[PDB]
Short mmCIF file of N, CA and C and ligand atoms in Angstrom, two decimals:
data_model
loop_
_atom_site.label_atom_id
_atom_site.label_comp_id
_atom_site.label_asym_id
_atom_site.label_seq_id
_atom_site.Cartn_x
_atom_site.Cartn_y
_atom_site.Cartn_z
N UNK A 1 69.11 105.25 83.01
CA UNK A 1 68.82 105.97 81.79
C UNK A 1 69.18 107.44 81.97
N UNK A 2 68.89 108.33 80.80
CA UNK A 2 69.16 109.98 81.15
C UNK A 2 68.80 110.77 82.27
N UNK A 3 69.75 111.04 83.20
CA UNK A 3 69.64 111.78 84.35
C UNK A 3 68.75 110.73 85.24
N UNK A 4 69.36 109.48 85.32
CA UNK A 4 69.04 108.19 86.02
C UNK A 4 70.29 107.27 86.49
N UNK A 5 70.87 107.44 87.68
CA UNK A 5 72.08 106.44 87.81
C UNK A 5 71.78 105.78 89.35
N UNK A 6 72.03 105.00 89.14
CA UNK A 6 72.36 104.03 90.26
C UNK A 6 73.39 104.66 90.91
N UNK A 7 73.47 104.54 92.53
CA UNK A 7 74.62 104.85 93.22
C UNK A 7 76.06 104.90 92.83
N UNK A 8 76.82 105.92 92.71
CA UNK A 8 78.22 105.41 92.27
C UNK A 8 79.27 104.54 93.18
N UNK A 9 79.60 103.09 92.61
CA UNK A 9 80.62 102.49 93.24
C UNK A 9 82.32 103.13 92.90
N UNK A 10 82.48 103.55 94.56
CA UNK A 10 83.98 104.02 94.35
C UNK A 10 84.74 103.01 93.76
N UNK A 11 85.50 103.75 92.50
CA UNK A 11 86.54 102.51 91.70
C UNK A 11 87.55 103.57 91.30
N UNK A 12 88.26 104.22 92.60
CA UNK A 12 89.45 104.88 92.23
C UNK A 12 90.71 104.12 92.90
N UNK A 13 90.59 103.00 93.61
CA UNK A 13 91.83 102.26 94.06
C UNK A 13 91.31 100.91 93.10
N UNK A 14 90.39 100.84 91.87
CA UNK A 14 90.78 99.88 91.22
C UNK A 14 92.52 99.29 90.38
N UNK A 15 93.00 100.30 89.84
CA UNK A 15 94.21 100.48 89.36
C UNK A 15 95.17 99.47 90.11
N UNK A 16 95.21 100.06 91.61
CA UNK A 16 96.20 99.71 92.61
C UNK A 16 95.86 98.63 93.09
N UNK A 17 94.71 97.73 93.62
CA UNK A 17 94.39 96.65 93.58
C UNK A 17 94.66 95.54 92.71
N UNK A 18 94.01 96.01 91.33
CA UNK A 18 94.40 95.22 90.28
C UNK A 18 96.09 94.88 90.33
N UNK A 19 96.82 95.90 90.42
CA UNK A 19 98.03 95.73 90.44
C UNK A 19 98.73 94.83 91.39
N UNK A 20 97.89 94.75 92.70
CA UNK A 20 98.36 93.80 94.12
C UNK A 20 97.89 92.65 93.35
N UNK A 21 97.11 92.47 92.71
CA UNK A 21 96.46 91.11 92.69
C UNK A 21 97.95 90.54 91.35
N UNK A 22 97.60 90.94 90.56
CA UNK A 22 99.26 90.61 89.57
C UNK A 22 100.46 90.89 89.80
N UNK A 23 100.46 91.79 91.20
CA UNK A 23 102.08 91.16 91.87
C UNK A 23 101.76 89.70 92.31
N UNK A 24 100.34 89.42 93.21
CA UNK A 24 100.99 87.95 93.93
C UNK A 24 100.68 86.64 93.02
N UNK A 25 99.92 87.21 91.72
CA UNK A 25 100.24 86.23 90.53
C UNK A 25 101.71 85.94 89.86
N UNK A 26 102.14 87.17 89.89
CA UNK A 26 103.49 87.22 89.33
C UNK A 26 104.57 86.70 90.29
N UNK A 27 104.18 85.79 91.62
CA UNK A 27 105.18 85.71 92.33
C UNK A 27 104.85 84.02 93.42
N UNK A 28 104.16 83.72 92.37
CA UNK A 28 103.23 82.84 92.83
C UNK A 28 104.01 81.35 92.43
N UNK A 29 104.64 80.36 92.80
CA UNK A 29 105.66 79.61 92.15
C UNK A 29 104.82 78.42 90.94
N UNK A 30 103.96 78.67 90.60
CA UNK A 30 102.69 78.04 89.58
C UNK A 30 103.06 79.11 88.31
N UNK A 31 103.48 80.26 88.45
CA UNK A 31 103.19 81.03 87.73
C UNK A 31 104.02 81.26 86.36
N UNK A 32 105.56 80.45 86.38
CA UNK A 32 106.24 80.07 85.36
C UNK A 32 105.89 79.98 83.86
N UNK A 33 104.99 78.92 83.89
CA UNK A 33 104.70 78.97 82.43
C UNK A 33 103.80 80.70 81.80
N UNK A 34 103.58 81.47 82.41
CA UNK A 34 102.43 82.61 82.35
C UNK A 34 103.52 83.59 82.49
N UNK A 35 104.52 83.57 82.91
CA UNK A 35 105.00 85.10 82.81
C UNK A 35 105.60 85.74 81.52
N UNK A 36 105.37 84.85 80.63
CA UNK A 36 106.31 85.63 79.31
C UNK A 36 105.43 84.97 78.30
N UNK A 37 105.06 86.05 77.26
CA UNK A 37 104.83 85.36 75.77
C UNK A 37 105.04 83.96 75.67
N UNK A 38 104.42 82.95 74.94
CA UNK A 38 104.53 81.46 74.10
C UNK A 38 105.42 81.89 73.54
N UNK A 39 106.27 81.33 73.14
CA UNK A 39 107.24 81.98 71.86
C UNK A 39 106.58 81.01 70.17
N UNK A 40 106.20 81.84 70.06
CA UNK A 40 105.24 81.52 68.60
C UNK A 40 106.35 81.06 67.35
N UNK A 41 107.37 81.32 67.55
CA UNK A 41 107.99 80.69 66.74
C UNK A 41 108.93 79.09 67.12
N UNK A 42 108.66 78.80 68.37
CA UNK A 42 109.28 77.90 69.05
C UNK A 42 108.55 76.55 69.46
N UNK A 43 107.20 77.10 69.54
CA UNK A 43 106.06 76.13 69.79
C UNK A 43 105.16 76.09 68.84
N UNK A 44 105.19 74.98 68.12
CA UNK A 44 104.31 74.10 67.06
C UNK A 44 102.88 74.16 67.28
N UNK A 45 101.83 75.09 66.40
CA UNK A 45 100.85 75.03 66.11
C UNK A 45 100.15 76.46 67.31
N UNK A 46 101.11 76.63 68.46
CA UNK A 46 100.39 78.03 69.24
C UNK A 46 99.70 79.00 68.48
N UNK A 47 100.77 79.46 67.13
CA UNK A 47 100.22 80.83 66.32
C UNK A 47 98.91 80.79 65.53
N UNK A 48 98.91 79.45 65.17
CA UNK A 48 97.40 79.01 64.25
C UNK A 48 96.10 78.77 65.39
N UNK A 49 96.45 78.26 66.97
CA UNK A 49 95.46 77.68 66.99
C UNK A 49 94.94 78.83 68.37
N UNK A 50 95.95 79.60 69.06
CA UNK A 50 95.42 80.17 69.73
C UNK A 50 95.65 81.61 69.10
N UNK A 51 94.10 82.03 69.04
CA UNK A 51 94.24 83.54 68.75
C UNK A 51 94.60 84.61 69.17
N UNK A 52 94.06 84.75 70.34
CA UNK A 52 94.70 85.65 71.37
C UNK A 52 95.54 85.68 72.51
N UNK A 53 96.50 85.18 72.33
CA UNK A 53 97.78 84.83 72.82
C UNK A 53 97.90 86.42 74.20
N UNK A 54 97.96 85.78 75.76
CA UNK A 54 97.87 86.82 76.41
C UNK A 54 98.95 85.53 77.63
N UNK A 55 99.68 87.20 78.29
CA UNK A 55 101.00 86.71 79.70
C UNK A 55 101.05 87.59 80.76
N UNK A 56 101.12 87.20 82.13
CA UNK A 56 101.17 88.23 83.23
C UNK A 56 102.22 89.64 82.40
N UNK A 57 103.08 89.00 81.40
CA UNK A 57 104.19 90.38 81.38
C UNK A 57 103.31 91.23 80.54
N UNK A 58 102.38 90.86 79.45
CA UNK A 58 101.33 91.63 78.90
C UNK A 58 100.29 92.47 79.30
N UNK A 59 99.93 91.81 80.45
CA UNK A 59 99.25 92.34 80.99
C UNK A 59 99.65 93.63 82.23
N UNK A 60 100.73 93.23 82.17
CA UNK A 60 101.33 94.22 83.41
C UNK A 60 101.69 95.35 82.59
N UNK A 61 102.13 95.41 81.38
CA UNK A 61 102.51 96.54 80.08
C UNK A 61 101.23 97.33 80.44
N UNK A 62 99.79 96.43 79.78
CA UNK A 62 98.80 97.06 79.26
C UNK A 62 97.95 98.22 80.67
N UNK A 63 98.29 97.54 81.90
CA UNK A 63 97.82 98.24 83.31
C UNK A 63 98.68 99.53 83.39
N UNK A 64 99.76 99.62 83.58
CA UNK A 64 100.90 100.42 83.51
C UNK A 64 100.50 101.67 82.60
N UNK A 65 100.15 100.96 81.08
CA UNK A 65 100.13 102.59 80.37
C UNK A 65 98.76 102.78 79.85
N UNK A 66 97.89 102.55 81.09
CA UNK A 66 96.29 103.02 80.89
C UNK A 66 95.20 102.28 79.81
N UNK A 67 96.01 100.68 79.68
CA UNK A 67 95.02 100.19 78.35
C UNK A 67 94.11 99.65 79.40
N UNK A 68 93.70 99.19 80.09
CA UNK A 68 92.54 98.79 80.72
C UNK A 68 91.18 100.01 81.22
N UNK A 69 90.30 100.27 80.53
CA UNK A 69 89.00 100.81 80.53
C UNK A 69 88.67 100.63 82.42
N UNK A 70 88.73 99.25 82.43
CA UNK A 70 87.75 99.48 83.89
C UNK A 70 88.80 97.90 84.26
N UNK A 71 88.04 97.48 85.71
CA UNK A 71 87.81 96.29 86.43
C UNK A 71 88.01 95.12 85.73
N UNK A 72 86.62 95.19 85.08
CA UNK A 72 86.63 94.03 83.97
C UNK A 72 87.32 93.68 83.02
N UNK A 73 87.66 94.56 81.94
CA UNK A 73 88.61 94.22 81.05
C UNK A 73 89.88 93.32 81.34
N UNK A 74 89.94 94.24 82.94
CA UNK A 74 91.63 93.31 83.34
C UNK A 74 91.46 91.76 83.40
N UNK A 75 90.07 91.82 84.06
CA UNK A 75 90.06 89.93 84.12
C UNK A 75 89.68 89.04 83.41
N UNK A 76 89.36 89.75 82.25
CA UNK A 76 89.07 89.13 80.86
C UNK A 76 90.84 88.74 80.02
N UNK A 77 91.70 89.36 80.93
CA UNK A 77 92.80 89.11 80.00
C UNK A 77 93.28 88.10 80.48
N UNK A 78 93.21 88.37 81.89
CA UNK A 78 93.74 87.07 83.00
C UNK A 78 93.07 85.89 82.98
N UNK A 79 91.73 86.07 82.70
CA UNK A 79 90.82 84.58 82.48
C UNK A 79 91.50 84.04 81.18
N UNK A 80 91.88 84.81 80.31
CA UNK A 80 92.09 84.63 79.00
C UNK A 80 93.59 84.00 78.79
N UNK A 81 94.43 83.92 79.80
CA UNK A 81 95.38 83.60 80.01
C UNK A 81 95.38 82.01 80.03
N UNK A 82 94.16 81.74 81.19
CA UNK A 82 94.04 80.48 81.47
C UNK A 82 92.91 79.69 80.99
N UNK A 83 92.52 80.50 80.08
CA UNK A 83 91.55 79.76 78.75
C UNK A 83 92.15 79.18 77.67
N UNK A 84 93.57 80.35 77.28
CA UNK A 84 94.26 79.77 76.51
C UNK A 84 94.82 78.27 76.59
N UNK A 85 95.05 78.47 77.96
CA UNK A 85 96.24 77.07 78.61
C UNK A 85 95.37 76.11 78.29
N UNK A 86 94.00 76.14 78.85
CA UNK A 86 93.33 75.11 78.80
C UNK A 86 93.01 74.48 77.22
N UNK A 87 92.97 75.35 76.47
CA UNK A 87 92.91 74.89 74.95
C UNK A 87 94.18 74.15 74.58
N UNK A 88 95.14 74.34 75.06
CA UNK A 88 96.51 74.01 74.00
C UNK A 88 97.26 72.80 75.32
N UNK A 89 96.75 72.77 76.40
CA UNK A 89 97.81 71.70 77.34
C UNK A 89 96.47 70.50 77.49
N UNK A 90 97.29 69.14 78.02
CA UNK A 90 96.79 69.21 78.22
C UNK A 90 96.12 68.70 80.12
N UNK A 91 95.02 68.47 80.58
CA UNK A 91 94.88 68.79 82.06
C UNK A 91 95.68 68.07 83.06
N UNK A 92 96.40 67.15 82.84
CA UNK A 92 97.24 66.53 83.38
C UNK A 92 98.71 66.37 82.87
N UNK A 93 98.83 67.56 82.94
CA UNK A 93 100.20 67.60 82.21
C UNK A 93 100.90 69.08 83.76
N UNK A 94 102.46 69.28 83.92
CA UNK A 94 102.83 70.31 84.82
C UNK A 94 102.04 72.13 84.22
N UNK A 95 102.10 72.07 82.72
CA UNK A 95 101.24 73.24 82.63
C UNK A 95 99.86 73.41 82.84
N UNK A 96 99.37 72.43 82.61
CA UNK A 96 97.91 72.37 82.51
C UNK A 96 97.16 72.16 84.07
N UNK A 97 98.20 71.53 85.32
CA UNK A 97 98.07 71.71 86.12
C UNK A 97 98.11 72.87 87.13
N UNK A 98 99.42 73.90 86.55
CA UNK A 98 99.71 74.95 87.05
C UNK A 98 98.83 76.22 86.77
N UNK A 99 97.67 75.93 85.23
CA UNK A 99 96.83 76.80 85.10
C UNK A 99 95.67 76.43 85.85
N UNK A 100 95.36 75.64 85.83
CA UNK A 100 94.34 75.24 87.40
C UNK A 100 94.46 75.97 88.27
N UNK A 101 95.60 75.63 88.74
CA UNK A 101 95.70 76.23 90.48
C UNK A 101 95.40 77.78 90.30
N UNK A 102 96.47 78.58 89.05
CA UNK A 102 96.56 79.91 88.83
C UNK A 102 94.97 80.34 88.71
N UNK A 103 94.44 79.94 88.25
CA UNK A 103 92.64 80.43 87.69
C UNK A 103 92.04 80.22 89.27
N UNK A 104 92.33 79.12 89.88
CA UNK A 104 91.82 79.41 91.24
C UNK A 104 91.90 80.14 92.26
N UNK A 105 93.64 80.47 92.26
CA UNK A 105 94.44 81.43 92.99
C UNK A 105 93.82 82.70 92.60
N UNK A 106 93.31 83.06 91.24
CA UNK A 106 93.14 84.56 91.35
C UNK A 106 91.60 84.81 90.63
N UNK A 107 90.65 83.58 90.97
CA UNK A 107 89.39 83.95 91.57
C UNK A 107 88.83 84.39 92.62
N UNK A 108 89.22 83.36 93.40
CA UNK A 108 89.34 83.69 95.14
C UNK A 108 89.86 85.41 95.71
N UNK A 109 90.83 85.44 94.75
CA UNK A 109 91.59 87.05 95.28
C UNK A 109 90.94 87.99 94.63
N UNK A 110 90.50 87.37 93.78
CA UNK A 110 89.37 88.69 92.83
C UNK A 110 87.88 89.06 93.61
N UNK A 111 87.63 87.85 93.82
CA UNK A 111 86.46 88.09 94.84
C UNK A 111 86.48 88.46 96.40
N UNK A 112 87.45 88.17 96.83
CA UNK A 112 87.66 88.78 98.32
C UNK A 112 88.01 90.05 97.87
N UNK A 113 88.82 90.54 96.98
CA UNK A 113 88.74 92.16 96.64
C UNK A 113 87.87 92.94 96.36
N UNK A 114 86.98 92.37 95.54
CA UNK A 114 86.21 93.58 94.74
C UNK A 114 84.54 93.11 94.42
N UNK A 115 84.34 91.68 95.52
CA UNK A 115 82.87 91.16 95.62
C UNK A 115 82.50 90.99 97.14
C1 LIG B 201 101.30 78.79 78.78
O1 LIG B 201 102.30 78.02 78.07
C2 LIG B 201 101.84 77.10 77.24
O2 LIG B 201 100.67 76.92 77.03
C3 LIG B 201 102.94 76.28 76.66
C4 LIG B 201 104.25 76.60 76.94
C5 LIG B 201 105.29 75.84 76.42
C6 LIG B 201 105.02 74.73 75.62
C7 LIG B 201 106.16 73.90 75.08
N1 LIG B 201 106.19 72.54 75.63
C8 LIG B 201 107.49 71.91 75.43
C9 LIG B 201 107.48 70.49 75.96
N2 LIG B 201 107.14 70.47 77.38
C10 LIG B 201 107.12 69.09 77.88
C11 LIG B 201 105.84 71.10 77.57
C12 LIG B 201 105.86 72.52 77.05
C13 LIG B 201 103.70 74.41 75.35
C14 LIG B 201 102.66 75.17 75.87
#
């Protein structure tokens, strides 16, 4: 509360972390279907049914020119990545498999980083 804070956690190499963690997403051979926009005009029913349509290349824009607030936001985009998948594939299919692995791949790296 006012003139009440809890210890400050250093979060000035958040930026640069975040950024290691979406290079080895971005390079990750699972990571195909996730690196570029759906193309909403190419795939039947994406634009109606998923709302917030999010891609490692989006996300690497939004880090780059300061749209991420903090920590969190970033992994709300990246969870959001593979929330999407999970709505529109389905789990036994090469995408729906490759968002599996990806959501696991960069829990694990999220938490050995920054838990
Ligand atoms: C993250 O990407 C997606 O969720 C996504 C991407 C591409 C398609 C088009 N399908 C064309 C037919 N193909 C057998 C399966 C992909 C559908 C979904």
């Amino acid at each position: 509360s006012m003139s009440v804070k809890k210890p400050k956690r250093d979060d000035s190499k958040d930026l640069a972390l975040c950024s290691m963690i979406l290079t080895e997403m971005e390079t990750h051979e699972d990571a195909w279907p996730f690196l570029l926009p759906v193309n909403l005009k190419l795939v039947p029913g994406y634009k109606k049914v998923i709302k917030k349509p999010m891609d490692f290349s989006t996300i690497r824009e939004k880090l780059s020119s300061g749209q991420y607030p903090n920590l969190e936001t970033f992994a709300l985009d990246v969870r959001l990545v593979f929330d999407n998948c999970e709505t529109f594939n389905e789990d036994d299919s090469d995408i729906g498999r490759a968002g599996h692995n990806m959501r696991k791949y960069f829990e694990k790296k999220w938490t050995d980083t920054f838990k």
